[PDB]
Enzyme design. Structure first.
Site, PDB file in Angstrom:
ATOM      1  N   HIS A  69      25.253 -10.967  -3.999  1.00 54.25           N
ATOM      2  CA  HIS A  69      24.866 -10.160  -5.268  1.00 54.25           C
ATOM      3  C   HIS A  69      25.958 -10.954  -6.214  1.00 54.25           C
ATOM      4  CE1 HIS A  69      22.834  -6.566  -3.135  1.00 54.25           C
ATOM      5  NE2 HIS A  69      21.937  -7.373  -3.449  1.00 54.25           N
ATOM      6  N   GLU A  72      28.979  -9.415  -8.464  1.00 52.37           N
ATOM      7  CA  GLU A  72      30.323  -8.825  -7.910  1.00 52.37           C
ATOM      8  C   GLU A  72      31.159  -9.887  -7.539  1.00 52.37           C
ATOM      9  OE1 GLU A  72      28.069  -7.034  -4.512  1.00 52.37           O
ATOM     10  OE2 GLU A  72      26.504  -6.349  -5.800  1.00 52.37           O
ATOM     11  N   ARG A 127      22.311  -9.985 -10.415  1.00 49.94           N
ATOM     12  CA  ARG A 127      22.419  -9.650  -9.057  1.00 49.94           C
ATOM     13  C   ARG A 127      21.366 -10.286  -7.990  1.00 49.94           C
ATOM     14  NH1 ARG A 127      19.600  -4.539  -6.466  1.00 49.94           N
ATOM     15  NH2 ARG A 127      21.727  -4.147  -5.619  1.00 49.94           N
ATOM     16  N   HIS A 196      30.990  -6.902  -0.647  1.00 52.04           N
ATOM     17  CA  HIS A 196      30.437  -6.465  -1.840  1.00 52.04           C
ATOM     18  C   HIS A 196      31.923  -5.603  -2.364  1.00 52.04           C
ATOM     19  CE1 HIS A 196      26.281  -6.628  -0.831  1.00 52.04           C
ATOM     20  NE2 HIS A 196      26.742  -6.976   0.447  1.00 52.04           N
ATOM     21  N   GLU A 270      32.566  -2.724   0.509  1.00 56.47           N
ATOM     22  CA  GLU A 270      32.473  -2.370  -0.932  1.00 56.47           C
ATOM     23  C   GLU A 270      33.564  -2.119  -1.679  1.00 56.47           C
ATOM     24  OE1 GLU A 270      29.332  -2.284  -2.475  1.00 56.47           O
ATOM     25  OE2 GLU A 270      27.935  -2.219  -0.903  1.00 56.47           O
TER      26      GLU A 270
HETATM   27  C1  LIG Z   1      27.142  -1.669  -5.048  1.00 56.61           C
HETATM   28  S1  LIG Z   1      26.114  -2.699  -4.043  1.00 56.61           S
HETATM   29  N1  LIG Z   1      24.567  -3.083  -4.673  1.00 56.61           N
HETATM   30  N2  LIG Z   1      26.690  -3.910  -3.285  1.00 56.61           N
HETATM   31  C2  LIG Z   1      25.595  -1.418  -2.764  1.00 56.61           C
HETATM   32  C3  LIG Z   1      24.948  -2.403  -1.407  1.00 56.61           C
HETATM   33  C4  LIG Z   1      25.229  -1.218  -0.290  1.00 56.61           C
HETATM   34  C5  LIG Z   1      24.477  -1.824   1.126  1.00 56.61           C
HETATM   35  C6  LIG Z   1      25.671  -2.367   1.895  1.00 56.61           C
HETATM   36  C7  LIG Z   1      24.866  -3.130   3.208  1.00 56.61           C
HETATM   37  C8  LIG Z   1      23.653  -2.996   3.377  1.00 56.61           C
HETATM   38  C9  LIG Z   1      22.248  -2.368   2.486  1.00 56.61           C
HETATM   39  C10 LIG Z   1      22.905  -1.951   1.235  1.00 56.61           C
HETATM   40  C11 LIG Z   1      23.401  -2.555  -1.463  1.00 56.61           C
HETATM   41  O1  LIG Z   1      22.548  -1.458  -2.136  1.00 56.61           O
HETATM   42  O2  LIG Z   1      23.136  -3.697  -1.070  1.00 56.61           O
HETATM   43 ZN   LIG Z   2      26.191  -6.100  -3.811  1.00 54.43          ZN
END
Ligand SMILES: CS(=N)(=N)C[C@@H](Cc1ccccc1)C(=O)O
Ligand SMILES: [Zn+2]
Length: 307
Positions: A69, A72, A127, A196, A270
């Site tokens: 993404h 980030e 993203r 993340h 995260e």
């Molecule tokens: C804040 S964010 N957009 N990084 C949250 C990240 C949470 C996630 C971790 C693993 C797997 C699927 C989803 C997402 O929605 O992709």
């Molecule tokens: Zn992310």
């Protein structure tokens, strides 16, 4: 700039810089790191993985991807930090050296180069990838929703204009497909970590189903320990649990897929801030985040070499 000791780890960098950094690192520690190209991005940019190894044929390995993404930034930043850290800690840190003496580390710093370049050139909050086409004037797919792990199920959007667009089909995005093929071909990955970017969570599989993974007891303790280790530096507090249980349902996730491939140590990190700054984390928080995050990563790696 001229060497990896001169590179400014306390600031955010452009695509070129990180790429150049890659070459310096390989030049400086030729016997430990190699730069592999597992693909070309949608816009034709090389997709590189840095391989840390002490030898062996096809040793059990550790998978680590950052910046899937694009916005980030702390992850790409932490990415470059880790790469240098690996070269520094080998032979000095008794625990890390034990790890590299038996396992290889695959590190992908810029998993989504197209979006990354875009966050520098036009939209800082971008993203998704930059793939085009269809009956839409919207561009890109949410790369973390394009994986063949409950692909298209609730927790992803079928609308291309959506921020959580899953894409046309599982693995439609090259950036994704390039990893799948790499990992499937390797066939000896033991851990799979995806980094993340913001909310301070340690997640372990299933975002797509309410079903509990068989290894839940074990994954849970590791996460517990990882989070415990991470907080020991600056007291940064992380929450841990399964994806669906701690956040919300999300389909086509990286970690769900990896786990389904039999890679037990599938965790998603995260970082760093719970909203104060969000994706626009102050550059002054780069090192600290990298430092602490490393503690949590090494924790998981130690568990891996041991089981
Ligand atoms: C804040 S964010 N957009 N990084 C949250 C990240 C949470 C996630 C971790 C693993 C797997 C699927 C989803 C997402 O929605 O992709
Ligand atoms: Zn992310």
């Amino acid at each position: 700039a001229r060497s990896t000791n001169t590179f400014n780890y306390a600031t955010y960098h452009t695509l070129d810089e990180i790429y150049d950094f890659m070459d310096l690192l390989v030049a400086e520690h030729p016997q430990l790191v190699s730069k592999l190209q597992i693909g070309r991005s949608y816009e034709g940019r090389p997709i590189y993985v840095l391989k840390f190894s002490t030898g062996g044929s096809n040793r059990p390995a550790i998978w680590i991807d950052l910046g899937i993404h694009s916005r980030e930034w702390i992850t790409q930043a932490t990415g470059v930090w880790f790469a240098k850290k690996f070269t520094e800690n080998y032979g000095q840190n008794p625990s890390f050296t034990a790890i590299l003496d038996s396992m290889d580390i695959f590190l992908e710093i810029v998993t989504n180069p197209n979006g990354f370049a875009f966050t520098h050139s036009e939209n800082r909050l971008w993203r998704k990838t930059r793939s085009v086409t269809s009956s839409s004037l919207c561009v890109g797919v949410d790369a973390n929703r394009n994986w063949d792990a409950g692909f298209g199920k609730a927790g992803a959007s079928s609308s291309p204009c959506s921020e959580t667009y899953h894409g046309k089909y599982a693995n439609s995005e090259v950036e994704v497909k390039s990893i799948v093929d790499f990992v499937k071909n390797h066939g000896n990955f033991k851990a799979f970590l995806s980094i993340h970017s913001y909310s301070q969570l340690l997640l372990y599989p299933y975002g797509y189903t309410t079903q509990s993974i068989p290894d839940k007891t074990e994954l849970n303790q590791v996460a517990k320990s990882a989070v415990a280790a991470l907080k020991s530096l600056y007291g940064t507090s992380y929450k841990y649990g399964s994806i669906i249980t701690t956040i919300y349902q999300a389909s086509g996730g990286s970690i769900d897929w990896s786990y389904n491939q039999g890679i037990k140590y599938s965790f998603t990190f995260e970082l760093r801030d719970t909203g104060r700054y969000g994706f626009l984390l102050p550059a002054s928080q780069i090192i600290p985040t990298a430092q602490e995050t490393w503690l949590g990563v090494l924790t998981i790696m130690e568990h891996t070499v041991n089981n």
